[PDB]
Symmetry: D2
Subunit: 274 residues, 4 copies
Amino acid sequence: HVLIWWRGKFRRADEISLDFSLFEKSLQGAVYETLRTYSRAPFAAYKHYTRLKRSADFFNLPLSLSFDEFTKVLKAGADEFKQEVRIKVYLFPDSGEVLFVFSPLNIPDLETGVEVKISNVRRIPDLSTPPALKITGRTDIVLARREIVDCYDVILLGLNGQVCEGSFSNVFLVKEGKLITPSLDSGILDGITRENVIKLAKSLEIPVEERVVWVWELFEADEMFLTHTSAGVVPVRRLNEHSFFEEEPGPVTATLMENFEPFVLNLEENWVGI
Amino acid sequence: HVLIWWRGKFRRADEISLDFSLFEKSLQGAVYETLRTYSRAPFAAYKHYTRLKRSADFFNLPLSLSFDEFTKVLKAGADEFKQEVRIKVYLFPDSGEVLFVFSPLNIPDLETGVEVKISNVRRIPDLSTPPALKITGRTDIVLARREIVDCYDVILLGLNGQVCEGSFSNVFLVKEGKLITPSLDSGILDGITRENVIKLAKSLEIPVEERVVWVWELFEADEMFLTHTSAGVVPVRRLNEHSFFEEEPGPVTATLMENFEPFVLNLEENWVGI
Amino acid sequence: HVLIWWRGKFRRADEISLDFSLFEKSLQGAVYETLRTYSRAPFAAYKHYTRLKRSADFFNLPLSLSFDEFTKVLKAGADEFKQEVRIKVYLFPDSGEVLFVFSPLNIPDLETGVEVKISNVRRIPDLSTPPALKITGRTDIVLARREIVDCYDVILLGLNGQVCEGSFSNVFLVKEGKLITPSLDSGILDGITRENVIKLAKSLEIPVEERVVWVWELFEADEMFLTHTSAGVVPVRRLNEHSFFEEEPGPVTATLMENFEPFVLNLEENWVGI
Amino acid sequence: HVLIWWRGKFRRADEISLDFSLFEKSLQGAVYETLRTYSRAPFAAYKHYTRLKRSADFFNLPLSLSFDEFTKVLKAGADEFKQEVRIKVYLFPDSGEVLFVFSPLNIPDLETGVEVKISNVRRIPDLSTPPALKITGRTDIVLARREIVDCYDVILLGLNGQVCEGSFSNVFLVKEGKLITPSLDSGILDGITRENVIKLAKSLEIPVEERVVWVWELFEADEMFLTHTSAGVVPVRRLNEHSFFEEEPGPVTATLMENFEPFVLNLEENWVGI
Ligand SMILES: Cc1ncc(COP(=O)(O)O)c(C=O)c1O
Ligand SMILES: Cc1ncc(COP(=O)(O)O)c(C=O)c1O
Ligand SMILES: [Cl-]
Ligand SMILES: [Cl-]
Ligand SMILES: [Cl-]
Ligand SMILES: [Cl-]
């Protein structure tokens, strides 16, 4: 049950009709964002809109849609499901055409923790590409996602062995009661889930450090977890062959994931304009 | 007047209907190769086929068309024009689908030379993406293309300041009668025209060095030129604000240009199977 | 005519008697500073003392000498010459022993400009060694100085091709009337002559930019010059095979070098405690 | 009780008088090699001579002593002790002067294993200094030595996070019965003990891989050990906070240790010319 909004109308996601020149050009990549709903309301819509604009600015391609129109399509689309939706928004090169894809959000039970592995792909450094450019063809993320076989996500290190992030998530570790996450200067995407978790940690009086984190610190951590739009906080039970836990996520991870949804649902900055 | 070949037949390049999920996946990029025709015969076809296979093998992707079938599509499409054509070939990871785009080759007289600039985008390091991978979404090329404002092409350096390539071309310099070009070890996208010019130079007993070339050597060169499929040898009259000439290129470039077409068009290795 | 201060007494520089264990240990390097005199008064004595302390702190080896004692030895030593002196100060590992070497400053006529060349040695990056550690055995500076054969100094680029500095000087360029010099974040030593020249440029209403400077900008510059303790402002007439001028240094360089000595002789921060 | 050989004769290592300018130049560093004796006979003398020549050749420095003269000084000095000795050999660039330092080898029982830590100093890149250059002032080793506080040695990684070496040792890991060690291509100072252990492993049919080793593999290893001249094979019981064992090393390390002395002492290549 997949719905799309394309060229002014909602539509079935069986076939797509587009100008051939747009298709050939889209092979160079589309700028994009992913959203989910809570109670069928689009989450962090304004935050995602401004990130989209920022990705679009790395090309002086202005955004065609207003925030007001963006929210209108998001809400009309989500309203056609009796269930939470995942929403992908693509902005196309030169044309400025926008495509929304709505599909049911089927989020699994991750209380037992996931497996992650160190990627063979290093994150592209700033001198080659801005880390915050969310574009569909960027080869670090394209090549790294193809490595996800017997794990949930792969961890991209930067060129010097600093922890950057997962192929579709941000990384946090816990050590001696402190919540530690790579700084934006490590060369990472400023995830919206990450941002919310940092604020939640502070509201719970958990100490937080945003800094350069070296790969070997993950192997000495008391806890590790991932953050991304669809799932929120995702506990990591094993990195490569290194287990953090057997059954229960660690205590800092557990408090953050139980408090995540109530905290973000009542933080106004995640609901502006909706 | 664009013609395409897609899913078993030739079509007008006006609009295209695609399986929607194919379209979505195509946004991650296609493996690509470009050819042109001389006398409406596709040039260096076998060489271009084997190079395409090389990038396809990186993704464990078999070519759905044999060399023989490949040449049949190329000849068939080129025969529909009353003029020389540019042909772009796209190969899609996992699906193995092939897309050909034929268009009129409009080739200007560039004897007078072009302007080029040093790009602000460094070639993606080998730890992040193979330098020789011809995938349409690679962000070094994509972002470097957007800097082409008052110039012909821009020059991408590697992280260390060595010369790699232009955004659509290979780079050659001449210093004290030697033809010098970045080695494959410099981490480059190597085009067939580059190899052809190297062989031409050797046949004329012009010394050739394929080595690491530092950016500042471009600024001290006696002559500089670009190579690419559609235009062959393109003299550079100016790099940033640094002039090489005002009217006509130097002796080594001029000799290479005047001998290029006679030499490459009479070499059997460029016509195998056509 | 070379004088030394060693183990509490002034001495002839023919022989030196030291504990063998100190000699073996000194093969690992001594922290050091170089000074010159104006009117036989030690220049920027306090500035050099604090840099020495900072180099010493990269080892938690505290400085044995007080500033007051430092100035006392500097002045007593300089007072024994009827001529300006060059002064080298070495601080030795673990022991904290200090050695001063006084020799006549024989400064040549550099009004005609000097030749410099790009070094084959890249400046050691911060992850390997702090750029501000002035130690006698650091291999970037040791290896680069051995390259000075038919030039005055060699220019060390950083790992990415940014201009860092000369083997014993800092680098400035002039472009469209702006004075431009590598920022400290480029990974360089904060030279005391450099600092004074930046202040002098500002006092003369010359615009100054401290930023990342890429190697190719030197080849497009209107003017280039070096700064170091012994000589002050040193005009560069040629970089590699690229001439900036034939006879006369450019106008910005010329104003700075004529105004340098009067400016620094009347700036109190260069004379504190003397 | 230190004995030295300097300028044609053996001397007490109490005080030393030097030509002052020699001393000043010695502060830039010496090429070095270390040996020990078994039964008061200098071990792997020819191997150590040829390695010294290799670093000396980098500076176009001929060895002032022939192999035969070298062995005479080594035997003569070792014969003055009633005990095994450590011998350090220093060679000075340009002058070609040689300094030998003989001292009692006091060798502890390290069967129980040592503690090591990951250093905060990255191995100097190849663009700045050759990785295999054994010069006493190299700042990666000098600064890494100062971190040895509550541990035996620290581990230097390269800029990319690969394992290179300890500050005075080579690094080996064991994983699934394979002995793994950084390749020469990783950019390392290769010691003679490393080569001897590799040959020992092969003679015992233990599989050996010389390859690029990433830091995190140390944290997942079954066993880890160091090699260096004075101690041979040194088991690592703990890396940072990560324990490998509490009482005795694993089977591969234990076998290598128990077979080391019998094997290396009965190999003619380690005794040529003695
Ligand atoms: C590389 C990368 N890192 C992190 C994220 C997570 O960011 P957010 O929390 O906004 O979903 C994403 C988005 O999925 C991403 O693609
Ligand atoms: C590498 C390096 N850069 C720059 C300088 C110049 O600094 P200052 O102006 O304090 O002499 C020096 C000192 O000679 C140096 O060794
Ligand atoms: Cl142009
Ligand atoms: Cl750049
Ligand atoms: Cl220990
Ligand atoms: Cl580090």
